[PDB]
Amino acid sequence: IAHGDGRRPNKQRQYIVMKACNKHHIGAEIELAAADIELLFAEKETPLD
- Contacts with other proteins by CB under 8 A lie at 34-35, 38-39
What are the helix (H) ranges across the chain?
34-38
Question: What single string gives the DSSP state of each residue in 37-49?
Answer: HHTTTSPP-STT-
Q: Which is nearer to other proteins, 15 or 41 (CB)?
A: 41
CB of 27 to other proteins, least distance (A): 28
CB of 43 to other proteins, least distance (A): 13
Give kind and range of the element (H or E) at residue 34: helix 34-38
CB of 19 to other proteins, least distance (A): 54
